[PDB]
Amino acid sequence: YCFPLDAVGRTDTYQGIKANQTTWTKDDSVNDANEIGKGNPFAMEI
Amino acid sequence: YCFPLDAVGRTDTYQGIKANTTWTKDDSVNDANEIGKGNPFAMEI
């Protein structure tokens, strides 16, 4: 495999949330635009 | 070349159509098929 230079590739943007129990709220001690991928790193095969 | 794991890479979504010349939706075909036009996406090393 070929992998992205950052070893992840495309990500969505995530904010940190904390539980208040079953209700969640934004966590203001966490950055609100974290780049995180779901699943495996993007790859190409050769 | 390096190729995507599914050997295609980016695709658009296509519905099946049939000639009725006039064309209409073909209901026995899924309306959201991923098919690429052209060659598979590739990188070169």
Place of tokens 């780049």: A35
Q: Are A41 and A7 in contact (CB under 8 A)?
A: yes
Enumerate the residues of chain B whose CB falls inside 8 A of the CB of residue A45.
2-5
Q: What is the resolution of this structure in A?
A: 2.1
Q: Does B1 touch chain A (CB under 8 A)?
A: yes
**Method of determination used here:** X-ray
Listing DSSP states for A1-46 in one string gives: -B--TTSS-S-EEE--EEE----EEE-TTS-S-EEE-SSSPP-EE-
Which residue from A7, A42, A9 is spatially nearest to B3, judged by alpha carbons? Answer: A42
Q: Does B35 touch chain A (CB under 8 A)?
A: no
